[PDB]
């Protein structure tokens, strides 16, 4: 349910056993999110914590669209990092090709030409600015969730 900044990718990748590939980094993120809880922690800031680490995120401007509408949006778009959480897909490829793996349906859609990134998913995407050890109040929230 998120895209990773360069910084968050590096912090996640530092703890990996396998090689530091895009797919392995996102797989580690997805495993973390399975055990983490969400905190609406400040204006424009969402934290996800498992009581040991915390992913700090900011909202992204996205739009709910049908797959067909998304296909129109991505006409002629070049190679992007494309993320589809429900398919466990994080791939450097062209969006039109990527969308062959996305079944018809309504999805939150985000694309950014400066960062060359695309997200399609059922949950609204956030952008993770860092991944770091959890602070005391985040740990307390986790314990009492």
Q: How far apart are CA 116 and CA 118, in angstroms?
A: 7
> Which residue, 67, 86, 103, 70, is CA-closest to 1?
86
Domains: count for the chain: 2
- 105 with 69, same domain? yes
Q: Residue 24, SS3? A: helix
Measure the CA dihedral 5/45/53/50, to 10°: -120
Q: What resolution in angstroms, rounded to 1 decimal?
A: 1.2
Q: How far apart are CA 9 and CA 4, in angstroms?
A: 6
By what technique were these coordinates determined? Answer: X-ray
- 119 with 74, same domain? yes
- 120 with 140, same domain? no
Domain that holds residue 7: 1-60+125-145
- 6 with 21, same domain? yes
**CA angle (127 as vertex; 125, 132 as ends), nearest 5:** 130
Q: How many residues are listed for the chain in this entry?
A: 145
**CA angle (111 as vertex; 50, 65 as ends), nearest 5:** 90
Residue 20 sits in a domain whose CATH number is: 3.30.2310
């Amino acid at each position: 349910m998120m895209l990773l900044t360069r910084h968050a990718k590096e912090r996640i990748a530092k703890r990996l056993a396998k090689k530091r590939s895009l797919s392995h980094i996102y797989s580690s993120l997805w495993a973390f999110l399975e055990r983490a809880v969400r905190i609406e922690i400040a204006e424009g800031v969402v934290a996800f914590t498992d009581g040991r680490k915390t992913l700090v995120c900011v909202p992204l401007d996205c739009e709910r669209l049908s797959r067909g509408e998304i296909l129109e949006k991505v006409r002629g778009v070049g190679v992007y990092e494309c993320i589809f959480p429900e398919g466990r897909l994080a791939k450097l490829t062209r969006p039109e090709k990527f969308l062959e793996s996305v079944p018809p349906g309504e999805y939150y859609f985000y694309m950014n030409d400066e960062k060359k990134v695309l997200y399609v998913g059922k949950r609204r995407p956030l952008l993770a600015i860092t991944f770091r050890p959890a602070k005391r109040d985040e740990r307390l929230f986790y314990i009492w969730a």
